């Protein structure tokens, strides 16, 4: 009976193991599918961040082209306005320096041009 | 009061001179090189992180295969040990039950197997 209890115990555990062994082929399948699924998520995730990095890069390149263009245009317009002010400033100086009697319009023009040259030089920042 | 005029003129000529700045071609060149450098830095950095990202993926993938292999091996090992314990466990019970008088060594073996069965069943819980 202590013996019969031992045997019954062993046979009980044997039966339990037999049960909890399940279909061992089926279990190997759940594991394979679990792993294939995790591998795919890993790939999606990697592909997600790679697309992220690509897209972010091309947007910055686009922002960079835009700023560059604005800079080039900003320098050209400044250059052109300066040439126009310099031609007028000089002509106005020469007209004044040779005038028998500087007309009020010429003196006004000198004053306006002087102001504009100051803004143009200040805008040289 | 013709000194106000000369001060005006010199002032204009001074500001004109200060403004006179070019060479705008050299300046355009400075701008082009600064933009190319920033363009190339964007590409290097992107390429550097993309390779870092690949390296990370291959590490995670390796950690994944390893866990997978360990689990498959862990389960194959449990199943096969179970087949052998069931086989041995059954035979021992049959030997014990058929014995007119079970030797102590046989009974010691039964006690040992009983313990092994308990362990196999416990680690068979997930």
UniProtKB/Swiss-Prot annotation, chain A:
Tissue expression pattern: Expressed during embryogenesis, mainly in nervous tissues. Expressed in the embryonic central and peripheral nervous systems including the embryonic brain. In third instar larva it is expressed in the larval central nervous system including the brain and the ventral ganglion, in two glands (the ring gland and the salivary gland, and in parts of the foregut) the gastric caeca and the proventriculus.
Gene disruption: observed consequences: In larval brain, results in deregulated cell cycle and defective differentiation of immature intermediate neuroblast progenitors ultimately leading to overgrowth and proliferation. RNAi-mediated knockdown in the larval brain results in overproliferation of type II neuroblast cells on the dorsal side of the larval brains but had no effect in the type I neuroblast lineage in the ventral nerve cord. Conditional RNAi-mediated knockdown in type II neuroblast stem cells results in the same phenotype.
Highest taxon above the source species: Eukaryota
Subcellular location(s) per record: Cytoplasm; Cytoplasm, Cell cortex
Assembly mode: Interacts with nanos (nos) and pum. Acts via the formation of a quaternary complex composed of pum, nanos, brat and the 3'-UTR mRNA of hb. Not recruited by nanos and pum to cyclin B 3'-UTR mRNA. Might interact with mira; the interaction seems to be important for brat localization during mitosis. Interacts with Ago1.
Other noteworthy facts: The neuroblast overproliferation phenotype of brat knockout mutants is used as a well characterized brain tumor model. Early stages of tumorigenesis can be investigated because the tumor initiating cells of the type II neural stem cell lineage are known.
Function: A NHL-domain family protein that functions as a translational repressor to inhibit cell proliferation. Plays a central role in translation repression of hb mRNA by being recruited by nanos (nos) and pum to the Nanos Response Element (NRE), a 16 bp sequence in the hb mRNA 3'-UTR. Probably recruited by other proteins to repress translation of other mRNAs in other tissues. Negatively regulates expression of Myc in a 3'-UTR dependent manner in both neural progenitor and epithelial cells. Regulates expression of mei-P26, possibly at transcriptional level.
Domain remark in the UniProt entry: The NHL repeats form six-bladed beta-propeller that mediate the interaction with the pumilio repeats of pum, and are essential for translational effector function.
Protein name: Protein brain tumor
Species of provenance: Drosophila melanogaster
């Amino acid at each position: 009976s202590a013996l019969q209890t031992l045997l019954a115990d062993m046979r009980g555990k044997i039966g339990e193991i037999v049960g909890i062994a399940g279909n061992s082929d089926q279990n190997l399948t759940k594991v394979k599918l679990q792993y294939q699924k995790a591998h795919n998520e890993l790939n999606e995730t990697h592909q997600f961040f790679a697309s992220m990095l690509d897209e972010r890069k091309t947007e910055l390149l686009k922002e960079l082209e835009t700023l560059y263009t604005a800079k080039v245009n900003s320098n050209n317009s400044w250059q052109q306005r300066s040439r126009d002010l310099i031609d007028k400033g000089l002509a106005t100086c020469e007209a004044v320096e040779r005038s028998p009697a500087p007309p009020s319009s010429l003196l006004t023009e000198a004053l306006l041009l002087r102001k504009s040259l100051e803004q143009q030089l200040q805008t040289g920042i």
